[PDB]
Write a protein that binds this ligand. Structure first.
Ligand SMILES: Nc1ncnc2c1ncn2[C@@H]1O[C@H](COP(=O)(O)OP(=O)(O)O)[C@@H](O)[C@H]1O
Ligand SMILES: Nc1ncnc2c1ncn2[C@@H]1O[C@H](COP(=O)(O)OP(=O)(O)O)[C@@H](O)[C@H]1O
Ligand SMILES: Nc1ncnc2c1ncn2[C@@H]1O[C@H](COP(=O)(O)OP(=O)(O)O)[C@@H](O)[C@H]1O
Ligand SMILES: Nc1ncnc2c1ncn2[C@@H]1O[C@H](COP(=O)(O)OP(=O)(O)O)[C@@H](O)[C@H]1O
Lengths: 804, 136, 52, 65, 48
């Protein structure tokens, strides 16, 4: 079969040959293995022989005299054969340092010295029983990052030049030589250390740093039992004699705690004999590092800031080739820029670039099913042809007068579908083996690029010379030929053009599914929304012509660049009597600018008026972090105390709020609206007296609402009745109201002392009430134009045409 | 049913010639014979004035099992939806006598949200019983 | 429905608008077929003005 | 994710019907396997040796479970 | 205080409108003069 040796057992024969090379030798004798094991720190070859007795000095001096009499040794070949034959005999436990004792006892040349020294053959059986129950521990319990980086099996790291260069300066210092990538679970922490190992093999690191990178696996050390001390001390011992830097993912879980494991890392990091790279969360960083003064002396605070929209585009360019090989699709250049812009304006689940890679992975995977499992444009014609083909065959075997007339109608519709199905079915059969071959020819070239780079880095210019110069240049012509012939054949079908190339329309499909926003709202750019904004608000809110213009004057000045980046979108302060357009105006703002009416939070002052609820403005801080584009509404602002306005002062001045967990929520693209119920000159001066002199000056626009005018009442009934007809279009019912009925409901519902609330209640309790009465007995049938006019006694009645 | 289960294995075992014989000959021939026996059997129900009934599984059979498990008779479930909302204001006035202006307002919010005159994002009806108790 | 604070009052407001509430386990029970009726105690014109 | 009664076993059973048919992409073929926890505890570290052999056969064959 | 709001509700208001439709292109010189009516207006330097 095949034998498997650890890294410690492999270097044992190499270290034994190094000691024998200085004494002029041409062969490696198995006696050199016992000499190396007796010169280690806390070896196991000495403690096991002590239990059985004997004299180790008489045995050690006997093994040293055998190597002197020496002129691959013939006796060494028997040791390698016994390790392969006896590898399937005992029970558990692989190979280590204690298992090599029984391999040397089977050699006749080594058994004579043991019997003449003290420990006989029968004593070796009971000695290995009580003790029973990258190096050795760095291979099964740890993963070397530099091995996978030099072998071409690591994802490229593009966009971390300002972070990797800082870690190098920390490791070169005398004190505080333990970096800690303090960030958030979503901004990238493990991939940062991946780029550092790439510069080690290339030689971009200074001469002061020559260590390696080892990923300490936490879940691997907890495998089994009690017995955790034997596994943790073995890793720290191998890293001291080899001089290497270990990487610890999530240090807050292993350092600071069930089984005490942080006690073995404190003396190592204090004497400078160990270098660790931390990568925990800022939430748990203040409870396991800053709490203990001894840990701050060795760890340095390294902040990890989330990249902006400019750096995110360059990150997706590095992983673009990785998805073009597995998914087997062609990623366009326009889909990369649109991915970084749509990942922070509609959906928000993590941070950059974590919340931007999932959009490319999901879009490239959707095309895999829509091409190999028959596209929708092709399967639609096959399903319609399947229902007609099975019906035509049933009439041919039945001789009847009514079967011949029906067969002519089915054949007339079958020939039209078959005429367009054959060019699509025959082309789909040829593209099935061609599209699947592109993925097969790409996955093999990806593996060849990894094996070619590994040979050039491990000093082996004999194997990589036939890959980069033969195996790759001779295969790029076939892969590029199939991709060119596939794109030309897709244009002949006149359908499914965006089913194989991930473009701007493909990214918008994933975002529209994970939320509910229609596709028509995704193509609308931010520039076209600010132009047609005044015409949209007037269609829903009428009468306040002086208030709509004031809203656009505070938003357009924050998007062009005529104001510093220290204030949010626009801070408003609605006043006037009740029922003037304070709640409806807020709902219409998110339905156009934010394209999400349901993303409007309402924090009432009925329960947050007390002083104990001021710190939860925190519940409001955590709520706005999940959804950036949100609408924070402040209802009943006149009842709030002075503690609420004092907390919101630092937000409008610094652009962000101080989080309790040390985080930072961006309050730049967040609207600030309020609601208050406080001719118009004395009303505005009243609200400025209750608040501070500084809070009223920071507010940009101070819109003061007024009562509804009788001239605007006629426009209200013209746009309110339109929504009723739109809800009845599914039943083919046309709702038409004459000019007589529009004037009766406008002169009765006029109540400026309370607002427009009794307005719609009068229509529902008269017009909408009698309209639904005829929809049950048989008055208004789905398919007749309804007429509503004024009767002879003055009452809104629906004219009917059918009886009960 | 036997040919329907065997036709599913034809598309999985990679059988093009075998699937063309079942999905184009076995299915149409087995469906025309079953539909012919159902039409000839229904013609004998009227020629005898007491044909074999209790075979059409419909509202008279599904509602019979529910009526025995719960308790409400079948006659209260076979009523039309467009006819129950009209006489709803008259059935509540049989036991409750005194609130002639309150019972009529109950059907105003129920009959409006079931005819498309109300948004589907809102529930059925929202009431708020106020005033003194003991009325009903 | 009058012997409570403002915690349950704000939770029932989202039912009359979105039509479904957010469950703690992770469900969205649609309240489109569940009528909502209340009982309180706050001629008839001066009675409804108190509960407002 | 779902309560034990909404239908989760039929999801893995219905997926195997589309694998043998051909509804899955031919460039990446998978196989549905049911890892029963009752047959692994029939012996006695017996559970550590039987479960490790099952996961090894799935990595070298490219299939789901 | 009224001076900070007058320069924004007259000179900065009409200037932001031209930067969204194509009135002031990035690379020209903006000229703000007083017209014959008597109001601070922003004169554009691009065709409609
Ligand atoms: N410069 C970069 N290029 C490509 N991918 C990156 C880069 N920086 C971070 N990432 C991605 O971010 C992810 C970070 O994962 P990790 O640090 O393990 O946990 P978290 O996602 O919580 O930060 C990685 O999977 C990596 O693919
Ligand atoms: N400009 C307007 N024209 C017609 N109706 C309006 C207008 N503004 C608001 N409304 C009506 O007012 C109602 C909402 O009132 P709301 O703003 O909550 O009153 P308040 O501001 O006192 O809280 C909506 O149902 C809407 O029909
Ligand atoms: N028309 C009626 N005939 C007989 N009893 C009635 C009538 N109307 C109301 N009641 C009785 O009056 C009682 C009113 O109870 P109620 O105060 O509503 O209880 P709760 O306060 O728990 O809702 C009911 O138990 C009912 O039996
Ligand atoms: N072909 C099918 N069509 C509809 N429902 C099915 C079908 N096959 C199985 N089910 C449903 O899936 C459920 C599976 O139940 P079970 O396997 O006991 O637990 P779980 O629901 O957790 O899988 C059954 O209750 C059954 O109603």
């Amino acid at each position: 079969s095949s034998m498997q040796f650890t890294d410690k057992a492999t270097e044992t024969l190499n270290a034994a040959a190094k000691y024998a090379a200085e004494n002029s030798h041409v062969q490696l004798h198995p006696s050199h293995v016992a000499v190396v094991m007796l010169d280690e720190e806390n070896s196991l070859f000495r403690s096991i022989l002590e239990k059985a007795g004997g004299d180790v000095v008489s045995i050690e001096r006997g093994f040293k005299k055998i190597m002197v009499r020496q002129p691959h040794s013939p006796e060494l070949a028997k040791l390698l054969h016994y390790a392969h034959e006896h590898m399937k005999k005992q029970r558990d436990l692989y190979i280590a340092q204690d298992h090599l004792i029984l391999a040397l006892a089977d050699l006749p040349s080594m058994a004579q010295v043991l019997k003449e020294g003290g420990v006989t053959k029968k004593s070796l059986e009971n000695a290995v029983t009580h003790v029973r129950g990258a190096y050795e521990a760095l291979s099964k319990y740890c993963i070397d990052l530099t091995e996978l980086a030099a072998s071409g099996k690591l994802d490229p790291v593009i966009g971390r030049d300002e972070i990797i260069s800082r870690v190098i300066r920390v490791l070169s210092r005398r004190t505080k030589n333990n970096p800690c990538l303090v960030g958030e679970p979503g901004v990238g922490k493990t991939a940062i250390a991946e780029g550092l190992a790439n510069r080690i093999v290339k030689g971009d690191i200074p001469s002061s740093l020559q260590k390696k990178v080892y990923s300490l696996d936490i879940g691997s050390l907890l495998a089994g039992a009690g017995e955790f001390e034997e596994r943790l001390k073995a890793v720290l011992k191998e890293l001291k004699e080899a001089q290497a830097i270990v990487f610890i993912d999530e240090i807050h879980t292993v350092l600071g705690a069930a089984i005490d494991a942080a006690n073995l890392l404190k003396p190592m990091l204090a004497r400078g004999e160990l270098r660790c790279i931390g990568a925990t969360t800022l939430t748990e960083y203040r409870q396991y590092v800053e709490k203990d003064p001894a840990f701050e002396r060795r760890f340095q605070l390294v902040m990890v800031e989330e990249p902006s929209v400019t750096d995110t585009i360059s990150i997706l360019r590095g992983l673009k080739e990785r998805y073009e090989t597995h998914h087997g699709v062609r990623i366009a250049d326009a889909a990369i820029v649109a991915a970084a812009q749509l990942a922070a304006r509609y959906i928000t689940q993590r941070f950059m670039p974590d919340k931007a890679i999932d959009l490319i992975d999901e879009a490239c995977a959707n095309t895999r099913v829509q091409l190999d499992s028959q596209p929708e444009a092709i399967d639609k014609l096959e399903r319609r042809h399947l229902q007609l083909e099975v019906e035509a065959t049933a009439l041919e075997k039945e001789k009847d007068a009514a079967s011949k007339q029906r067969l002519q109608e089915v054949r007339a519709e079958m020939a039209r579908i078959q005429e367009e199905l054959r060019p699509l079915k025959m082309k789909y059969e040829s593209e099935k083996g061609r599209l699947d071959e592109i993925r097969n020819l790409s996955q093999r070239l990806d593996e060849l690029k990894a094996k070619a780079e590994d040979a050039e880095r491990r000093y082996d210019l004999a194997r990589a010379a036939d890959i980069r110069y033969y195996a790759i240049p001779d295969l790029e012509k076939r892969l590029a030929q199939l991709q060119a012939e596939k794109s030309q054949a897709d244009a002949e079908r006149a359908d499914g053009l965006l089913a194989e190339v991930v473009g701007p329309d493909q990214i918008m499909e994933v975002v529209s599914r994970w939320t509910g926003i229609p596709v028509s709202n995704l193509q609308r750019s931010e520039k076209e929304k600010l132009l047609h904004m005044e015409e949209y608000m007037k269609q829903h809110v009428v009468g306040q012509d002086e208030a709509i213009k004031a809203i656009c004057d505070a938003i357009r000045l924050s998007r062009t660049g005529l104001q510093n980046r220290n204030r949010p979108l626009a801070s408003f302060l609605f006043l006037g009597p009740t029922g003037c357009g304070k709640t409806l105006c807020v709902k219409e703002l998110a339905a156009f600018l934010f394209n999400d009416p349901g993303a409007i939070v309402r924090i009432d002052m009925s329960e947050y008026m007390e002083k104990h609820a001021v710190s939860r403005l925190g519940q409001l801080t955590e709520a706005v972090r999940r959804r950036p584009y949100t609408v924070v509404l402040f209802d009943e602002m006149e009842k709030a105390h002075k503690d609420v306005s004092n907390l919101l002062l630092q937000i409008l001045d610094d652009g962000h709020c101080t989080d309790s967990k040390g985080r930072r929520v961006d309050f730049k693209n967040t609207i600030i609206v309020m609601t208050s119920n406080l001719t118009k000159n004395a009303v505005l001066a009243t609200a400025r007296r209750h608040f501070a002199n500084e809070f009223i000056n920071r507010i940009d626009e101070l819109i003061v609402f007024n009562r509804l005018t009788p001239s605007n009442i006629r426009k209200i009934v013209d746009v309110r009745l339109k929504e009723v007809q739109e809800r009845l279009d599914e039943k083919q019912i046309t709702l038409d109201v004459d000019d007589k009925a529009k004037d009766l409901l406008a002169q009765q519902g006029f109540d400026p002392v309370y607002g427009a609330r009794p307005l719609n209640r009068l229509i529902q309790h008269a017009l909408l009430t009698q309209l639904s009465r005829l929809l049950l007995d048989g008055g208004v049938r789905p398919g007749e134009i309804a007429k509503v006019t004024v009767d002879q006694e003055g009452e809104i009645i629906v004219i009917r045409n059918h009886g009960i």
